[PDB]
Design a protein around this ligand. Structure first.
Ligand code: HEM
Ligand SMILES: [Mg+2]
Length: 217
């Protein structure tokens, strides 16, 4: 829960999502990142972040498509790392698969580029959109195998909306820069800096409206 945290050990699976990695480190998800079921996913997202259980189920249904095992009713966090299923190029904190065949390890050089677009202590929708676009332009210019499919692009917009929605204020569309940086660089919730679990339930409609604002910006 909120009061426990420890880093992954050998055998603990981690993937390309900073938030799922964080929730496993806290034990909201199994700390070993394995055998994650619909019920575990829905309960972890609701307990930790106040994600609507309907949204949590939809996200699980995406996640489970990455498990290579036939007829799987679970996923492990490293299944999410399979290139161009849910994972995609032009991430904010991971390298493109092309360069070193590692699209899952946190990459400080990549993240430093993203952070350079967060110029003020509060991130707004415009700065969030700039950071993501800069990553797309950089991958496009440097990765000869760069692809951002229609679905990958929709995912990319949704991921930027997600850190605003889970950590910040969905009406103003703002979030403290330090909390987002803390999440990515520590894979721990920024509780000591004052972050509180969202008091309003986070539903599909909330994610949709914020995603569309990032697109419009
Ligand atoms: C079951 C639920 C979830 C699943 C299956 C999932 C899956 C993923 C995957 C596969 C990626 C990699 C995409 C890429 O290539 O960049 C990713 C990235 C990301 N996810 Fe999650 N995610 C979930 C929940 C969340 C939540 C609740 C948040 C709230 C903060 C979140 C925030 C992010 C962010 C900000 C990224 C971008 C990472 C980057 O660009 O480096 N995710 N997620
Ligand atoms: Mg990626």
């Amino acid at each position: 829960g909120f009061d426990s945290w420890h880093p992954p050990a050998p055998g603990d699976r981690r993937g390309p999502c900073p938030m799922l990695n964080t929730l496993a480190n806290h034990g909201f998800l199994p700390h070993n990142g394995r055998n994650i079921t619909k019920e575990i996913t829905v309960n972890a997202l609701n307990s930790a972040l106040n994600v609507n259980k309907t949204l949590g189920e939809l996200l699980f249904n995406f996640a489970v498509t990455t498990n290579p095992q036939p007829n799987a009713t679970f996923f492990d966090l490293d299944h999410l790392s399979r290139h161009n299923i849910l994972e995609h190029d032009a991430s904010l904190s991971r390298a493109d698969y092309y360069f070193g065949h590692d699209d899952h390890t946190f990459n400080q050089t990549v993240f430093d580029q993203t952070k350079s677009y967060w110029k003020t202590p509060i991130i707004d929708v415009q700065q969030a959109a700039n950071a993501r676009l800069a990553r797309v332009l950089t991958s496009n210019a440097t990765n000869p195998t760069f692809v951002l499919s229609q679905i990958g692009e929709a995912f990319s917009f949704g991921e930027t909306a997600a850190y605003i929605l889970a950590l910040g204020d969905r009406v103003s569309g703002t979030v403290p820069r330090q909390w987002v940086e803390y999440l990515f660089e520590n894979e721990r919730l920024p509780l000591e800096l004052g972050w509180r679990r969202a008091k309003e339930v986070i539903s599909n409609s909330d994610l949709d409206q914020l995603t569309n604002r990032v697109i419009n910006a």
